[PDB]
Design a protein around this ligand. Structure first.
Ligand SMILES: Nc1ncnc2c1ncn2[C@@H]1O[C@H](COP(=O)(O)OP(=O)(O)OP(=O)(O)O)[C@@H](O)[C@H]1O
Ligand SMILES: Nc1ncnc2c1ncn2[C@@H]1O[C@H](COP(=O)(O)OP(=O)(O)O)[C@@H](O)[C@H]1O
Ligand SMILES: Nc1ncnc2c1ncn2[C@@H]1O[C@H](COP(=O)(O)OP(=O)(O)O)[C@@H](O)[C@H]1O
Ligand SMILES: Nc1ncnc2c1ncn2[C@@H]1O[C@H](COP(=O)(O)OP(=O)(O)O)[C@@H](O)[C@H]1O
Lengths: 1488, 272, 143
């Protein structure tokens, strides 16, 4: 089908299917025409939609066919498409003939009439009038040379030059006065070409060329038009040098004309020579020298459409393949931009493809093999490859080369200035171009700075617009004062250096940092001397800004006044909006960018009467495919992306949004992945191109801005393509934030008035402390000097302080409510608010640091403040609280003394209150009242998860959902949680996400919020998403791309310090909205209290030992202290210690004690020593560490239990086992050896027969491993050199305890799906069967980190929801239903049986992980998957010791007889075995 | 390992060789107005930053060499580049000839830091007025084209002329017999390859390189007169690799000489 | 395998590569042009060995550029001399050859302005009507 009429071959399968299905729906074919045509965006038809009357371009310029094509006469799609194309070509040729004749009438004229010239320009198209001017000038020069052929004769060639001059004159008068934008572009293109023609004619005159065949004329690009030619297509021929090309005659619409500098002329010559020689050209050179645009201009001047691909790192092939075969069939040119950026394999593949196509092209000097198809390559096809420094080896002989080393900016500026109508353009260009060189060199380097050629063109266009506006203003003034109106008189008396300075300032000053502003002025003084500019204030806009700031409670100022800098920044933003369609507000978070543009939009709406609508889109949180749109790989259906959806909505003008002012704010970080597509929108073309090919024209009212905090990762291309406004942090001074908080407090009530009066009184009270250079400002300055666990942001501290003051006001309101008889009087109110404020600075500015810096801040504030403070000699004000009576009461009184139940010792739920517990409970209460998300940051353990959980369960209406974020966390996790616990409902405001349970605040606790990995551009997707819903109060549903407002949803996070391995620091923009509380390890006193309570509750089983509760706890704490002091994390990655170890200690002691009815003190010391060895000693690596541990526990035992016997309580064989005795009472090593030897014999008889020698290490290992299996959710991280017997002992213990061993058979093709299915089978085999499984894992079985992520989720939850879904999940539901029916539990709903399944797995399933002792590998494993180090217990098998080797040797070489009586004992025996008998026998010597 | 010991030896030797510290220039409003002071302050800041980075990296290498510090990824890469003899990428912030090894780079860095220290001392002793009369080697500077632009800006600002209307004239004279005019700036270290310059006149010679004693750059108003047939335009490359084009000088060839011969023989001025 | 250094060897290789029939065409002067081209090509290539001095960088003045120059000479001589056995040396399109081999061929790889100046100097020295005299010097003061 596509073979005939290959022009629609350009589109892919999707558009072919659409055009076949909707062939009768011609109104739905406009997208295909937009795709394949260059300028034609639609076809003009009649009301019947049955005859193709003409074509129309994206600008609005249309061409009417001389003989319209009737679709009814040719129902076939291809036939009438071919007829339309042929008609457009013939009509373009006829219009070219008409305009050439008209301009020839205009040609050879002493003077031209402006009205007739403007009428001629309006009649025809911009491309057509430019082509007609070129043809007329070429014919005139050829006639002059034919006359000159005689030689040594008079030169009417001068007249031809003069002719151009005179018409140039009228053009210089046409653009001065106001014109429609389309005619303005026509005049600009005509002026550019006329200037080029004048320059080349001057060169010819200087050269005194007198022959038409002289090469100096033949090099110049010549056009020849032959009316006599029968074929209209061949009427126009473009000949330059020896190369000849037939004009494309395809409608370009209106394109940006390229000024023809000498470099561009050289490019034209080289590429035309290459195309004549039937091989492409490569214009290599640095970025931004016009290589791509030079290629596009050459293509357009030949009447051809160039498809300029982008060769970014993320490059598509199938789209490239289809687009390239489409160009090959069409014959339109194709340009490659930055070929070198492609991947080496990608580069090789594309190079092979273009090699095949180029070979086909040279063979034509015809079909070629493309995508396993035959593609007819038209002779007119050409290929260009721009490179940045070489060509691939397979292409070096197939492509000519050309050097775009440096563009001609000096002539570019001059020609474009004459295009805008500037007089003295030469001086202005010679000033502006070196000025931009200075700006690019002398100004300090910044990410957002840009002084390239595109910046120059934008500045000059803005200067032309400014000059036109000033001309109009002077004209209106002349109309109002007098009547003498003369445009030439206004232009002559108009300063032009001042206009250029004003345009340069309006375009560049906003992007300049505070230090670079004076330098620019100096640069101007160096380039434009003696001439100064003065910015024109917008008084009406200033009044509207003042009113809007009053309405929004923002501080407004002028000049040096408070808020003046912000107001100037808003005005600069307005100017950039006026002179650009693409904006970028760069600056550190907290500079007021969001509020700046919001206030500007509101003021513009209230001033101009045009109501403004803002769409805020986060690009990083959403997926790029969902951002721009998805094309199905098979069904080929196009679903518009979020940006595409809103742009199409705006274009559709359904509710008058074209009348409105639409502002699309890309709030979020920018990286060169998505914005690459936006590069086609940010340019002067202003169109969005989709992968399906459908291009949407950007309406004038739409503005694209990127509210991005840093530009360290954005490419220079986007930096150059949009205006920049820099928002330094000094723009938003602290006084402004204080004023905003105070105004909001005084104006809006806290509940949604009595408490409004309370808020006003409180604001009056704290007004002295919030003044400039007040208590709060100095305290904040000092707090910035301290060190904090996370990065300090001023707005974070200020927001936390404001929230805590709001809680103070709420407490006052509650006190007044509960005391109707006596509402709190003014004096008590001042006392309470002052004291609470001091406490608020203390817990807000230093709430994320260690206790030492908290005390330092306390001392500083005590020194600097005047508020009454506690008189404690050493207790800081932090341990003090502010009572509702306005008094400093200790937190200790708030701490109760509870006695836990004996069976509840070390239980997961129980929390023993203490100082840190109550303080953090109060802080959590406050930050939960305002629903402000907060982050509990602290070392592993440290009582962070439980402290938060206790507070949340204490709160009645706030349900909790935990979400264990991993290094692979994605926003789909949050979406799944939302659809699991909440629901979307249609409300008058819009669609709203709310919890299914009414009147409940769902708290999405995130266990590891900084764990998720950041992209290569320093962005964490989940963090950006969370920030998006936190600050915008909602997100975007991608299923229908709709704004969802969050209701009754709040977030709380917890995380280890970012300094810890595997932890990424959070974004400052996110940290601004979340206060961070640093939950340090409980102190020795806190540990003493908490575990004295636990010990007292524990020892109630045995009253005769009760009196030892107080010292034992101390000992349990005491030893623990030096542990955390001795085996620091620096020595080994797993050398971490926490109160979790102490809790495990107490739980183990209780479990050992519960069986036994009575037990003496020596037995208790033995149990305590056994647990200390099993907790603080197996993790050790070096032998000396274990010796130190044993000696230290010995010393501690005597220090805290002096009246005890060391031989019995602390006997060296500390072996505890339940194998021999029914209870867990210590057993002698020999009897244990005998029993486990008998069990090993049974193991040999039943299971695999491998002889195992029983050295004493095996006893300890088989004891610890069995201990772990017996405890529920027993998970081990076995570490030891391979072959030491980790799997050997694991299988043995599993067999002894009845656990079935399950290892996964892993091979090279063992994919992630195979591991997932094995996990599903094991989960079925464990919970649905009530059958205990010992899961054998080795790091060899791990072929991907995803395995570790799934294991992490399993360990941290006892299950993974990801495995079991759909039909698999239904099968699981059936299985667990049968299992619960068998066991005796009747459950119906899926949730209860799923929870029962999770309980069965957590009590049955046992996963072990065997690994070799790679310390660096250990650290990477810990960082990648925290669960293997969070709750998994790990042992150090290491290598067999000398004793172990001796025993192995003897037992294995027992059969052989090395019994040699002739052996004599040497004087020196090289002993290496520690316990070698004093006389070595021969066998002993051999084993040694 | 012996490689560790010899790397310790060479790191200690370089730490002895490189000067200790560099002093930033003192900011002043009048100094800020002066463009030469701005350029030299930028150069001083860049040189001080690079010197501190290199000194700290060498100290870290020495500490690792004693064993007191472990080789982090950056330190490990630096050690690998040192042992292989390749120039570390972190050290190279200014333009450097491709084939230059580490030792030559350290020597060049030491010379540049010495020049910067002398420049800072002279500026501190006087001010911008004394800063104008400092003979500065173009090769020693990190960005010499910035220096050329700075001299152009200074001449334009002193005489209230526009930048685009100024043109450069080179007067090659001995350091002792030199005149320091208002628009004249001294430059040392330029070497002419392919010719000899006597009395500001070029003569073809077979010598590989003739050292120019002192080149005076003078910015003068555009006379708008065509250059004579004896005027030749010679590039000024930064190094012998001829990859950096700083600017172009104009000389007067002697009589009986042919400018085409000057073009063919590759006569050029080199900063170093 | 390497090409033997030497202007003589380079010219011999160039002459062997080109078919004998092409160099002997209707204009008897054509061969002369080809010889000059060969010499020029040799000179250019032989200045590559002295990369810092003869040029600024090692350009790829390969056989493709020589073939392009030969094709350009062929086309322009056929156009100027339309089947004429003899053509005057002045009538040869010298300007076309110089411009095309200064900008399109041998000049596409030239990015430095001074290398382009040197190429223009070589072209204006060699390709001229004055070459068609027996007194023409392909080089001066060689030894
Ligand atoms: N003109 C002003 N006067 C007083 N307070 C202001 C003013 N503008 C903004 N603020 C306040 O200062 C803070 C700045 O908030 P805003 O969202 O504007 O910052 P931003 O720099 O745009 O942040 P981000 O990069 O996170 O979007 C807010 O608390 C806001 O209420
Ligand atoms: N005559 C010209 N020569 C070179 N560049 C030009 C010319 N006229 C305009 N430009 C501008 O130069 C800018 C950069 O050109 P570009 O094609 O991006 O260079 P590169 O090929 O290195 O990417 C374009 O924005 C274009 O508008
Ligand atoms: N005030 C307290 N009351 C009871 N137990 C505590 C207290 N503080 C710490 N713990 C113990 O410390 C451990 C804290 O672990 P957890 O908070 O779950 O770590 P993370 O916060 O890193 O998840 C708990 O096992 C708990 O037994
Ligand atoms: N206590 C032991 N006595 C004798 N041989 C042992 C002992 N423990 C392990 N082995 C040997 O180790 C081999 C299996 O090692 P394995 O446990 O797979 O190594 P890894 O520690 O890597 O899991 C068996 O062949 C067995 O002979």
């Amino acid at each position: 089908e596509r073979s005939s009429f290959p022009r629609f071959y350009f589109v892919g399968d999707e558009d072919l299917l659409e055009i076949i299905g909707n062939s009768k729906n011609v109104a739905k074919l406009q997208k295909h025409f937009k795709k394949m045509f260059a300028g034609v965006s639609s076809i003009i038809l009649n009301e019947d939609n049955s005859v193709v009357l003409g074509i129309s371009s994206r600008e609005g310029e249309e061409v009417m066919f001389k003989t319209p094509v009737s679709i009814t006469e040719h129902p076939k799609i291809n036939e009438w498409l071919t007829l339309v194309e042929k008609e457009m070509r013939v009509t373009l040729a006829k219009l070219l003939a008409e305009s050439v004749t008209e301009v020839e009438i205009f040609g050879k004229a002493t003077s031209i009439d402006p009205n007739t010239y403007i009428t001629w320009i309006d009649k025809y198209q911009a491309q057509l009038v430019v082509l007609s001017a070129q043809i007329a000038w070429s014919e005139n020069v050829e006639t002059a040379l034919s006359s000159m052929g005689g030689g040594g004769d008079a030169a009417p060639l001068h007249s031809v030059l003069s002719n151009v001059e005179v018409t140039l004159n009228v053009l210089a008068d046409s653009v001065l006065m106001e014109q429609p934008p389309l005619r303005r572009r026509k005049l600009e293109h005509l002026i550019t070409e006329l200037v080029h023609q004048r320059d080349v004619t001057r060169s010819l005159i200087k050269s005194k060329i007198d022959n038409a065949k002289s090469f100096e004329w033949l090099s110049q690009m010549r056009f020849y038009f032959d009316p006599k030619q029968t074929d209209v297509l061949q009427q126009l021929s473009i000949q330059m040098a020896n190369a000849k090309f037939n004009y494309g005659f395809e409608y370009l619409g209106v394109q940006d004309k390229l000024v023809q500098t000498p470099l561009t002329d050289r490019c034209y010559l080289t590429m035309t020579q290459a195309l004549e020689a039937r091989l492409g050209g490569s214009p290599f050179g640095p970025a931004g020298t016009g290589k791509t645009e030079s290629v596009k201009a050459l293509g357009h001047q030949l009447g051809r459409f160039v498809l300029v691909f982008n060769c970014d790192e993320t490059f598509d092939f199938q789209a490239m393949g289809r687009i390239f075969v489409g160009l090959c069939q069409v014959g339109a040119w194709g340009c490659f931009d930055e070929f070198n950026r492609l991947e080496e394999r990608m580069l090789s593949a594309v190079s092979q493809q273009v090699q095949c196509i180029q070979e086909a092209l040279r063979e034509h000097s015809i079909t070629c093999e493309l995508l396993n198809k035959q593609v007819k390559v038209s002779p007119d096809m050409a290929i260009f490859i721009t490179m940045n420094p070489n060509l691939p080896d397979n292409l070096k002989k197939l492509f000519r080369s050309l050097a775009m080393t440096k563009p001609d900016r000096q002539l570019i500026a001059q020609v474009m200035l004459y295009s805008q109508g500037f007089r003295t353009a030469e001086v202005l260009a010679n000033k502006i171009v070196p000025f931009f060189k200075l700006c690019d060199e002398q100004l300090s380097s910044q990410s957002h700075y840009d002084f390239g050629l595109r910046a120059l063109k934008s500045v000059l266009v803005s200067a032309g617009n400014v000059k036109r506006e000033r001309i109009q203003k002077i004209k209106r003034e002349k109309e109002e004062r007098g009547e003498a109106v003369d445009e030439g008189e206004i232009a002559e008396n108009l300063p032009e250096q001042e206009i250029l300075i004003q345009s340069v300032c309006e375009t560049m000053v906003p992007k300049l940092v505070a230090e670079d502003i004076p330098l620019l002025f100096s640069l101007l003084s160096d380039v434009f001397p003696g001439v100064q500019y003065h910015r024109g204030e917008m008084t009406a806009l200033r009044e509207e800004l003042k009113k809007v700031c009053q309405e929004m409670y923002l501080t407004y100022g002028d000049g040096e006044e408070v808020g003046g800098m912000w107001v100037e920044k808003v005005l600069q933003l307005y100017q950039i909006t006026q002179i650009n369609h693409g904006l970028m507000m760069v600056g550190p978070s907290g500079s007021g960018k969001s509020m700046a543009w919001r206030v500007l939009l509101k003021a513009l709406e209230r001033l101009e009467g045009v109501e403004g609508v803002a769409h805020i889109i986060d690009p990083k949180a959403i997926s790029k495919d969902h951002l721009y749109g998805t094309l199905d790989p098979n069904t080929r259906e196009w679903t518009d992306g979020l940006f595409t959806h809103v742009l199409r909505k705006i274009i559709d003008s359904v509710r008058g949004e074209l009348q409105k002012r639409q502002w699309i704010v890309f709030d979020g970080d920018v990286d060169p992945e998505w914005v690459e597509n936006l590069n086609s929108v940010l340019d002067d073309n202003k169109l969005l191109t989709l992968p399906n090919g459908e291009r949407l024209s950007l309406p004038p009212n739409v503005r694209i801005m990127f509210e991005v905090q840093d530009l360290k990762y954005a490419t220079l291309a986007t930096v150059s393509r949009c205006g920049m406004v820099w928002f330094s942090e000094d723009v938003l001074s602290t006084d402004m934030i204080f004023n905003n908080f105070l105004a909001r407090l005084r104006s809006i009530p806290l509940d949604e008035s009595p408490m409004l009066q309370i808020q006003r009184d409180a604001a009056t009270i704290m007004q002295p402390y919030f003044t400039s250079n007040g208590l709060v400002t100095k305290a904040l300055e000092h707090a910035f000097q301290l060190e904090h666990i996370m990065d300090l942001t001023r707005l974070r501290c200020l927001g936390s302080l404001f929230s805590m003051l709001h809680q103070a006001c709420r407490n006052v309101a509650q006190y007044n409510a509960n005391h109707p008889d006596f509402p709190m009087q003014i004096e008590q109110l001042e006392r309470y608010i002052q004291r609470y404020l001091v406490y608020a600075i203390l817990w807000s500015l230093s709430g994320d640091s260690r206790l030492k810096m908290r005390a330092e801040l306390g001392e500083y504030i005590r020194r600097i403040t005047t508020v009454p403070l506690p008189t404690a000699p050493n207790i800081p004000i932090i341990d003090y609280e502010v009572s509702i009576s306005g008094e400093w009461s200790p937190w200790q009184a708030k701490v109760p003394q509870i006695e836990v139940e004996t069976h509840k010792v070390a239980a997961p739920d129980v929390v023993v209150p203490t100082l840190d517990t109550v303080r953090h409970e109060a802080l959590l209460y406050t930050w939960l009242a305002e629903h402000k998300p907060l982050v509990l940051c602290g070392p592993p353990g440290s009582g962070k998860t439980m402290t938060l959980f206790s507070a949340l369960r204490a709160l009645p209406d706030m349900e909790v959902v935990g979400l264990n974020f991993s290094s692979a966390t994605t926003p789909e996790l949050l979406l799944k949680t939302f659809d699991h616990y909440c629901e979307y409902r249609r409300t008058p405001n819009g669609v709203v996400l709310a919890p299914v349970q009414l009147g409940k605040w769902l708290v999405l606790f995130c266990d590891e919020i900084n764990l998720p990995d950041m992209d290569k551009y320093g962005t964490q997707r989940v963090i950006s998403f969370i920030r998006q819903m936190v600050e915008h109060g909602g997100f975007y549903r991608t299923s229908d791309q709709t704004w969802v407002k969050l209701e009754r949803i709040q977030f709380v996070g917890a995380c280890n310090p970012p300094t810890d391995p595997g932890r990424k620091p959070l974004s400052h923009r996110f940290l601004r909205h979340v206060p961070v509380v640093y939950v340090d390890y409980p102190g020795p006193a806190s540990l003493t209290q908490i575990y004295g309570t636990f010990n007292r509750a524990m020892l109630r089983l045995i009253p005769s030992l009760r009196t030892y509760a107080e010292p034992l706890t101390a000992a349990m704490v005491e030893f623990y202290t030096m542990s955390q002091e001795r085996f620091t994390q620096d020595t080994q990655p797993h050398y971490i210690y926490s109160p979790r170890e102490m809790t495990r200690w107490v739980r183990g002691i209780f479990e050992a004690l519960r069986p036994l009815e009575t037990l003496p003190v020596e037995g208790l010391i033995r149990i305590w020593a056994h647990e200390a060895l099993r907790l603080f000693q197996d993790r050790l690596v070096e032998d000396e560490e274990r010796r130190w541990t044993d000696e230290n526990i010995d010393t501690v035992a005597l220090k805290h239990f002096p009246n005890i016997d060391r031989e019995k309580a602390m006997s060296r064989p500390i072996l505890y086992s339940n194998w021999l005795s029914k209870d867990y009472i210590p057993v002698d090593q020999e009897e244990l050896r005998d029993y486990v030897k008998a069990r090993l014999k049974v193991f040999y008889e039943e299971e695999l027969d491998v002889p195992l020698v029983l050295f004493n290490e095996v006893l300890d290992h088989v004891l610890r491993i069995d201990r772990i299996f017996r405890q529920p959710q027993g998970h081990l991280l076995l570490i030891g050199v391979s072959g030491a017997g980790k799997t050997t002992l694991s299988r043995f213990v599993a067999w002894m305890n009845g656990l079935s061993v399950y290892q996964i058979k892993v091979h090279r093709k063992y994919t992630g799906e195979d591991f997932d299915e094995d996990l599903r089978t094991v989960l079925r085999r464990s919970g649905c069967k009530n059958e205990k499984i010992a899961f054998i894992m080795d790091e060899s079985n791990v072929l991907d980190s995803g395995f570790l992520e799934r294991m992490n989720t399993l360990l941290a939850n006892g299950e993974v929801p990801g495995l079991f879904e759909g039909d698999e999940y239904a099968t699981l539901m059936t299985q667990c239903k049968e299992g619960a029916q068998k066991e005796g539990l009747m459950l119906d709903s899926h949730e209860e049986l799923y929870k029962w399944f999770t309980s069965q797995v957590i009590r049955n399933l046992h996963v072990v992980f065997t690994m070799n002792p790679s310390s660096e590998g250990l650290k990477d494993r810990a960082a990648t998957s925290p669960a293997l180090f969070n709750r998994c217990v790990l042992n150090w098998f290491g290598d067999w010791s000398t004793e172990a080797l001796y025993q192995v040797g003897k037992e294995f070489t027992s059969k052989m007889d090395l019994e040699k009586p002739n052996y004599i004992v040497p004087d020196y025996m090289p002993v290496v075995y520690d316990k070698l008998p004093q006389p070595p026998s021969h066998r002993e010597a051999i084993v040694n | 390992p012996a490689w560790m010991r010899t790397l310790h030896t060479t790191a200690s030797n370089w730490l002895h060789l490189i000067p200790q510290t560099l002093s930033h220039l003192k900011r002043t409003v009048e100094n800020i107005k002066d463009p030469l002071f701005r350029f030299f302050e930028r150069e001083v800041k860049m040189g001080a930053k690079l010197l501190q980075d290199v000194r700290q990296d060498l100290a870290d290498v020495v500490q690792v060499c004693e064993g007191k510090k472990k080789q982090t990824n950056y330190l490990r890469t630096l050690i690998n580049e040192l042992v292989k003899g390749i120039l570390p990428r972190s050290w190279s912030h200014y333009t450097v000839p491709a084939g230059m090894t580490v030792i030559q780079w350290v020597s060049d860095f030491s010379e540049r830091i010495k020049q910067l220290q002398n420049i800072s001392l002279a500026a501190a002793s006087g001010g911008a007025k004394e800063l104008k009369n400092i003979h500065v080697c173009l090769g020693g500077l990190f960005v010499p084209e910035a220096y050329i632009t700075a001299t152009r800006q200074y001449v334009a600002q002193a005489n209230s002329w526009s930048l685009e209307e100024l043109c450069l004239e080179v007067n090659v004279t001995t350091s002792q017999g030199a005149t320091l005019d208002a628009c004249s700036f001294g430059v040392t270290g330029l070497k002419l390859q392919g010719a000899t310059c006597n009395n500001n006149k070029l003569s073809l010679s077979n010598a590989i390189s003739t050292a120019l004693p002192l080149t005076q750059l003078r910015w003068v108003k555009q006379t708008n007169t065509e250059k004579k047939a004896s005027v030749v335009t010679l590039p000024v490359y930064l190094n012998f690799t001829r990859a950096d084009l700083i600017f172009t000088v104009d000389f007067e060839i002697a009589t009986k000489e042919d400018p085409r011969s000057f073009y063919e023989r590759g006569v050029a001025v080199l900063c170093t | 395998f390497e090409p033997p250094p030497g202007v003589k060897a380079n010219m011999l290789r160039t002459f062997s590569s080109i078919p004998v029939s092409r160099i002997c065409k209707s204009p008897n002067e054509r061969a002369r042009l080809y010889f000059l081209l060969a010499w020029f090509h040799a000179i250019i290539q032989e200045r590559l060995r002295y990369a810092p001095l003869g040029w600024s960088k090692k350009y790829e003045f390969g056989e493709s550029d020589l073939r392009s120059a030969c094709d350009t000479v062929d086309t322009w001589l056929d156009d100027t001399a339309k089947g004429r056995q003899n053509i005057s040396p002045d009538k040869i399109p010298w300007s076309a050859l110089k411009t095309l081999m200064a900008q399109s061929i041998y000049g596409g790889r030239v990015d430095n302005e001074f290398d382009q100046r040197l190429l223009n100097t070589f072209l204006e020295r060699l390709f001229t009507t004055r070459s068609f005299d027996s007194e023409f010097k392909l080089a001066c003061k060689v030894d």
